[PDB]
Design a protein around this ligand. Structure first.
Ligand SMILES: Nc1nc2c(ncn2[C@@H]2O[C@H](COP(=O)(O)OP(=O)(O)OP(=O)(O)O)[C@@H](O)[C@H]2O)c(=O)[nH]1
Ligand SMILES: Nc1nc2c(ncn2[C@@H]2O[C@H](COP(=O)(O)OP(=O)(O)OP(=O)(O)O)[C@@H](O)[C@H]2O)c(=O)[nH]1
Ligand SMILES: Nc1nc2c(ncn2[C@@H]2O[C@H](COP(=O)(O)OP(=O)(O)O)[C@@H](O)[C@H]2O)c(=O)[nH]1
Ligand SMILES: Nc1nc2c(ncn2[C@@H]2O[C@H](COP(=O)(O)OP(=O)(O)O)[C@@H](O)[C@H]2O)c(=O)[nH]1
Ligand SMILES: [Mg+2]
Ligand SMILES: [Mg+2]
Lengths: 49, 47, 434, 430, 49, 431, 430
């Protein structure tokens, strides 16, 4: 009384790393990291006439 | 910089503790026994 | 296959994180450059992550809006350990201003920090929870900490979070505005953290002076004690023990109600080598020093209130039968009294790894130690005095113009006061007898 | 024939199971590699009761291990005799119940029990003539009590006519380490009484007490408590594996000890136990065995039988001894202490003799007694449970995943029903 | 049948024991493959420096 | 017996074209002279009968400095002397000059060189064309050549690698004009177009590569790597091979929609390359990160039409399948309703190569993806708005009209963009 | 006598065939150079079934390797055992279809398939008395499903009284490598039902699950997956090449399996399969084999056999055993699980025994079962197909090469009519 799914839940070895890292993934690509190099470097000066 | 430096620090005790805590330490009575049934001792072949 | 992610925010958080990571590296035997020496595995998987060949990477991220403390880490002896892009630094400090670190500057770092948190969490499979360190009396510590907790809650859900906050001492203090930003931070963390520990600085000074015989304690000495406490708390996950206790077996045994999750800490034995070997340090006597009121790591007296529950951990060569006799003796003792609706109030854990000693440190080498985490109604006094201080300051609206002009409305302070008053009422009505 | 399978659940249960298989294998002369190196032919005649025969002639125990935490297996596997167990029988999750009955019974046990229940069918269906099941678990832990009691329901639901035993450990207040022990223990006994044919209670408080008083060893350890239970476990089914004067299988004991269907909570004890300081001073005789047999301190529970009246008593004698001494001693005890025995059941003691004694001891005895004194343990658990429940303490973790307060109240009444019903026969007279 | 039953014992134990080396050998050479491959970066670090 | 011919028109294509050829020569061990010190070079090169090999490429330009730079560089002995077509007068940022005034007298020689190369090949897979779209000869000659090749060869697959203007960073002032006119030509004449604007590539160099002053030399190396990964399956054996013709049959739901944007991973400098493991599970996550898109667009604003990612290195079929199922679990990534499965995956054995003097660290795994998403409708809108402002007052118009182009050609070009945008909006709505 | 010819097409089919011939060659002791070096006399008695004799005493397989691209053909030649194949039988184009069913069936299908029938006619007429054909291919690809299905139609019209077998790999939804999988899979099924005598479905998803869970090997690869399928193909015709207690050739399996002519889609599996570290705890017996054989996890398809009912089932046994032990197992499994077996057809399991075990084992079984649960795959494929087809996505390629959308409507209805007609017997009652 066990189908093909819901059976991999049973622990087998340390090989579950290949199939269980991203259930609690904090979903994905939700945040932005575009042009966040402002902190590691110094911004170019901006001049008024 | 002065406080935190590169320090030299350097499982047998873990195994020794683990085995002892599952151990006996008190055994039981010492064994003089030999296996024999009651129906086989009384009924023997006669001449 | 169990993991945990540690978050350090603020100068105090970074300083204590440096000590605790040094302690973890020494305990697991990894050189400061990250390379394993010379040539029994997965003992480091709780805190570290293998690179596939040789060296290791901690599961931590460092946050601050000022690079004075961060750049020290990138230059010191541990420059090869941490990943270069998880030591996140800003440009302008919050300058002891909660509003700046929660509405003006803190909203430019939080996105990058959460991206780093995702990049750390997607590489783990058995995360028990998060550990977050922060000093509450500072701007960026209170601001970025609150924003981080608020974002992590919505982004994750039921994952446990442990906050080792450091409230300002009753009379000893460093800044002058720190009563203000404590109230807002407490209001923010109350409904967003699962377990909180009180680690105010004044008590640790007394413990050091009385036990280690130091007449001039420094911040370096205090951080070692907190690091040892963290190691004792988390050793049950990564070391073989007779009676193991996981992280999730705290939110089932220590917090009777969802709103009551503020709790104290105590460690024993803390002793110097000059008098360490004059006594046997039996488990029967070390458990008395744990419940000794002056040994509590927070400046709160349990004798002024009832005991709710007590979860306390042992490590060394302790025997389970010896623990039971000491617990029976403590229960027999009359000076310590529990609430009536808690007949059994002890959760005990036993581990085999003895407390590792740091070379060049202060503590000696001892075969046994105990770390105690208690929940009691006596914690009501710490909020009442802070409430009185905040009321005295806010009576005629001082220092407020430094917060209103940075985006916070005038009425925000009123709501936090109501939250504190309701919290005190909740402790009082819980502590009352039937 | 009449072979029985073994199921152990939880961290506490696995420790009992690991030591038990070490005791049986030494009795049957099975090496840690599973190769028979015995001396007599009797050691192999009835080995099919507990073992299975695989390719190469090695023997593998028919035990199923379950848990919710992967830390359990590597300790038991790495221990001595850990290679006997078939690796295919290890079934368990990765999260853990966290000493929470609801988690081990509603939110995680349900998703996983389908897998463990399959290998239970595989083991049971392979038997030519099944006798029954035996379960080892503790009533103070989450996964031990939670999944443990839920298996009892489903195993009974598919095999109603078979016999069932549970070696359950109840939490005692004198030595308690979990604050939610009264909660999960109360709920488990509700489900346990409905399904289990026989239940046996074992206390850590009594096991610590017996070690300090009789054995007089300075420091007890979990090895000692595990061995005392394991010694009594083998004695129950000893005559099932070996010949004797009066063989008595599991079913025979169930009939003769249960007057009414709801009274099936027994307390056991073993004899002889002596410190090796006085080991050569004692004389091993049948009268000597029965004096320590009925000793109040020798019981494996803190419930004192002198506070109640015995309903039925069972004694299983091991070794080479005569029947007349066995019969006459039970009669004399039943007459010298006639006040402690209920009167409307005349001669309420049963005896059985098996002539293959345990290794080391010339003669040994296991005692199983049904007495009205056990009600006080359910009472003292209930007092703690009702104290915490009135203030709704430590409750939102149980109610946060589908459980509601009426379940707690319903368990309270039924448990209170059982104890009130159980003392009815204590004062009943003819 | 008693002897051939025993004759399967020594064959099985050697086959299982032999299987252990392939598990160990693959792990040993994988570490060597990564060890030399990691050392190539230190050459790249110096060249970039 | 499989061949592809690459066309490099304009300065932008030529300089990107150069960087492709240090990588192609280095992979097969061909020295700059062209002499080797089995038949895997046949995709790009051709045996001369005894010794050297010549590329299957032609360089087109009207301004001699860039071509003469190649003809005097270290690769003077590699290319065939008469397949480097060089002009006299530059188009000078004018689309009308390169399509009506100059291009009428230029294509005839160009098609002759194409014909000579094509007849040598036997299994011609298709053509590759490189051109910056915001320039004179880049779009002026590119539009003319593509139209001519569409009737000379017919059904052959033409892949376009264009460089569209950045949203706010640019080097020209009239480039919004010649960009729009070029769209009407390549929309109906190119099978596959790739989004490769410059601003996005700047951000990758600054953040990932730890380069604080990126240059056009650095950018072209990144683009060259994508070309190698795209065509790696034609010349290297692997577990899952994908041909050039197996892009349009899997990435083009409708003939009008053939604009896709690419991403590459990993791109890490040697300073922090193996300070982490670079597993196959994590490289596929970096590919889908919106910051790693090679074009300045946000995929989070629209659905995904189809996805095609190529793996090269020592990956195994177990792990891609585990990783792909993880992506479908993600909530921030949502596919269009009528496409249940949208991934086409290929696996190759040859690891990516490292060029001396480069920046990328050598790794045993890499992934390059070409993704078709509805989010690419933003770039057309922002360029359309820029064209509307200038054309409102007919600025710069007199330059184009004087070169033989009609007045109303802008109007019919503007309508095509509006027609194109409504197609993307129509497709994205669920049924 | 009664020999068969093997035809393989497509990238997936060529890899399947390459490992299949290596398994057969080792079974008969044929070296890659074509020289016999066997040990048993039986290994040479029936070698004409798969091998054609050549001058010099070497044997050549009668296989027709067919494809549209040279990349995969050059790989199979460079591998081991690649010198057995006659270079004449390598027929291949230059342009390839590339996942386009219309291209592989209408444009390039018609112009190249004239050559392959030329060699097939040469091979078919040469043999003494033909038994049938067998084809391995994948339905998810263009050339494999496009030209492969046209090859069957042309052969069937010329050999109407012969047996036709196909080993089909259908695209599962869990693992997907092509976006156009639903279209070319649906069109092939319409042509496949009309002509193929027997059809067997295989899943990449199922094979991955078996290797990860049962074999417990950390590194599966396409070489390993092809190994499982290769053993299954050799099992079905084992009793045709070797003597046994009950001989049952391929035709005899058809009569006892297909009740109605349109229901000829089977799902297969092989046993015993065990991890190399846990094979010393198991016991190789007939009762143990049939449990693993009937297990839903062991099956090579994603469909769950317990979600439907078995129409007919067949099991082939290899090795030495007793017929009484086999017969009772089929009877016992039918009585225990009467709910899963359709009732208006009694005794719906066929058993065959061959006395030549596979190299390296003492017993082996092969399971072929016609179960109503296979309708799940046609349902999920149609659901994906009807989702894409409603918006006319990816459709301009098929209509661009001489096809019209009307053919899709006919294919969808006929495939849908297959499911409805196939589900009718699931709930049919006497
Ligand atoms: N335990 C401990 N606490 C510290 C240490 N340094 C600072 N603190 C606490 O931190 C509080 C003030 O915050 P800071 O640590 O100076 O810096 P911050 O929290 O990041 O806030 P900002 O100064 O605005 O950046 C003080 O009230 C101290 O109690 C330390 O080294 N150890
Ligand atoms: N990626 C990349 N783009 C370039 C490079 N050089 C120029 N470009 C782009 O080309 C655009 C302008 O075209 P030009 O490079 O001046 O030359 P053109 O396209 O052939 O047009 P003409 O000036 O008439 O020759 C600029 O907006 C740049 O974005 C380069 O080396 N690499
Ligand atoms: N006899 C015995 N009892 C044990 C042992 N380990 C733990 N226990 C008892 O089990 C109780 C805790 O049960 P627990 O381990 O949480 O059960 P679980 O939830 O099923 O894992 C404690 O009160 C201990 O007294 C052991 O090795 N032997
Ligand atoms: N069993 C098996 N399946 C394979 C193998 N290689 C590829 N496949 C499957 O075949 C599918 C691709 O089919 P394809 O090779 O394009 O078929 P073709 O167009 O007829 O050559 C993929 O989804 C794979 O799952 C293999 O070696 N063995
Ligand atoms: Mg500060
Ligand atoms: Mg130019």
């Amino acid at each position: 009384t066990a189908d093909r799914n819901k059976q991999a839940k049973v622990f087998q070895n340390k090989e579950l790393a290949k199939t269980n890292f991203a259930g609690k993934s904090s979903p994905g690509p939700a945040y932005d990291v575009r042009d966040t190099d402002y902190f590691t470097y110094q911004k170019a000066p901006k001049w008024k006439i | 910089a002065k406080t935190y430096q590169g320090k030299q620090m350097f499982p047998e005790k873990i195994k020794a503790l683990s085995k002892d805590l599952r151990a006996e330490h008190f055994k039981l009575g010492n064994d003089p026994q030999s296996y024999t049934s009651e129906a086989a001792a009384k009924f023997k072949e006669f001449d | 296959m169990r993991e945990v992610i540690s978050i350090h925010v603020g100068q105090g958080g970074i300083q204590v994180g440096n000590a605790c990571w040094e302690l973890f590296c020494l305990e697991h035997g990894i050189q400061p450059d990250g390379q394993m020496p010379s040539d029994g595995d997965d003992a480091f998987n709780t805190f570290f992550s293998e690179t596939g060949a040789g060296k290791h990477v901690p599961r931590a991220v460092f946050l601050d809006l000022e690079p004075t403390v961060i750049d020290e880490v990138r230059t010191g002896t541990y420059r090869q350990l941490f990943h270069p892009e998880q030591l996140i630094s800003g440009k302008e400090d919050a300058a002891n201003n909660f509003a700046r670190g929660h509405y003006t500057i803190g909203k430019e770092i939080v996105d990058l920090c959460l991206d780093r948190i995702r990049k750390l969490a997607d590489n783990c499979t058995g995360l028990q929870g998060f550990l977050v360190f922060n000093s509450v009396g500072g701007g960026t510590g209170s601001g970025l900490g609150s924003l981080l907790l608020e974002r992590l809650s919505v982004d994750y859900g039921k994952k446990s979070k442990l906050g080792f906050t450091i409230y300002p001492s009753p009379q000893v203090s460093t800044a002058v505005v720190e009563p203000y930003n404590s109230i807002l931070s407490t209001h923010s963390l109350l409904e967003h953290t699962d377990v909180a520990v009180m680690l105010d600085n004044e008590a640790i000074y007394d413990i050091c002076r009385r036990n280690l015989d130091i007449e001039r304690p420094t911040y370096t000495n205090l951080n070692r004690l907190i690091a040892q406490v963290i190691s004792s708390l988390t050793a049950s996950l990564r070391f073989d023990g007779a009676l193991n206790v996981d992280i999730t077996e705290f939110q089932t045994n220590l917090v009777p109600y969802p709103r009551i999750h503020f709790m104290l800490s105590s460690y024993a034995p803390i002793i110097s080598a000059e008098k360490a070997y004059h006594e046997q340090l039996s488990v029967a006597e070390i458990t008395n020093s744990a419940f000794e009121p002056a040994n509590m790591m927070a400046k709160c007296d349990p004798r002024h209130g009832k005991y709710m529950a007590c979860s306390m951990m042992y490590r060394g060569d302790v025997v389970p039968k010896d623990v039971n006799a000491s617990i029976a003796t403590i229960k027999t003792k009359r000076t310590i009294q529990f609430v009536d609706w808690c007949p059994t109030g002890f959760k005990v854990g036993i581990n085999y790894q003895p407390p590792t000693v740091v070379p060049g440190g202060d503590l000696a080498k001892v075969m046994r130690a105990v770390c105690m985490i208690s929940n009691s109604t006596a914690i009501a006094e710490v909020f009442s005095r802070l409430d009185h201080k905040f009321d005295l300051m806010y009576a005629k609206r001082a220092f407020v113009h430094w917060y209103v002009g940075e985006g916070m409305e005038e009425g925000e302070f009123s709501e936090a006061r109501e939250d504190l008053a309701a919290l005190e009422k909740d402790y009082e009505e819980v502590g009352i007898e039937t | 024939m009449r072979e029985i399978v073994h199921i152990q659940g939880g961290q506490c249960g696995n420790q009992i199971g690991a030591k038990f298989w070490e005791v049986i294998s030494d009795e049957h002369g099975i090496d840690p590699t599973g190769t028979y190196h015995g001396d007599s032919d009797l050691q192999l005649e009835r080995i099919n009761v507990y073992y299975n025969e695989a390719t190469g002639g090695r023997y593998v125990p028919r035990a199923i291990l379950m848990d919710l935490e992967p830390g359990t297996m590597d300790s038991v596997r790495a221990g001595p005799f850990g290679q006997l167990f078939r690796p295919d029988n290890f079934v368990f999750g990765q999260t853990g119940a966290g000493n929470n009955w609801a988690k081990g019974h509603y939110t995680e046990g349900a998703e996983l029990i389908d897998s463990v229940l399959d290998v239970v069918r595989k083991e049971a269906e392979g038997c030519d003539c099944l006798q029954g099941f035996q379960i080892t678990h503790s009533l103070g832990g989450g996964t031990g009590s939670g999944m443990g009691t839920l298996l009892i329901s489903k195993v009974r639901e598919e095999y109603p006519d078979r016999i069932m035993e549970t070696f359950s450990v109840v939490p005692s207040p004198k030595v308690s380490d979990t604050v939610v022990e009264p909660y999960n223990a109360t709920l488990s006994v509700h489900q346990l009484v409905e399904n289990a044919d026989e239940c046996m209670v074992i206390d850590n408080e009594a096991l610590y007490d017996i070690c300090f008083r009789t054995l007089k060893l300075t420091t007890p350890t979990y090895g000692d408590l595990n061995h005392l239970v394991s010694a009594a476990m083998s004695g129950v089914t000893c005559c099932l594996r070996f010949p004797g004067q009066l063989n008595s299988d599991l079913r025979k004991l169930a009939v003769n000890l249960i007057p009414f269907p709801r009274l099936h909570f027994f307390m056991i004890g073993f004899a002889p136990l002596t410190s090796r300081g006085s080991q050569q001073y004692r004389a091993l005789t049948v009268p000597e065995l029965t004096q320590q047999m009925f000793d109040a301190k020798n019981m494996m529970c803190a419930a004192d039988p002198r506070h109640g009246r015995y309903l039925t008593a069972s004694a299983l004698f091991r070794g080479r001894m005569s029947t007349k001494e066995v019969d006459e001693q039970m009669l004399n005890v039943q007459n010298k202490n006639s006040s402690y025995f209920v009167e409307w059941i005349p001669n309420n003691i049963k005896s059985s003799i098996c002539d293959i004694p345990p290794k080391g001891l010339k003669m040994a005895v296991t005692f199983v007694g049904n007495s009205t004194a056990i009600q006080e343990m359910f009472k003292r658990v209930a007092e703690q449970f009702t104290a915490m429940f009135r203030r709704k303490a430590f409750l939102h973790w149980y109610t946060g995943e589908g459980m509601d307060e009426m379940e707690f109240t319903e368990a309270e009444s039924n448990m209170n029903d059982l104890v009130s019903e159980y003392q009815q026969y204590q004062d009943a007279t003819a | 049948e008693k002897e051939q039953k025993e004759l399967e014992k020594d064959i099985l134990t050697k086959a299982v024991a032999a299987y252990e080396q392939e598990v160990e050998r693959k792990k040993k050479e994988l570490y060597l493959t990564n060890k030399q491959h990691q050392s190539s970066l230190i050459g790249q670090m110096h060249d970039k420096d």
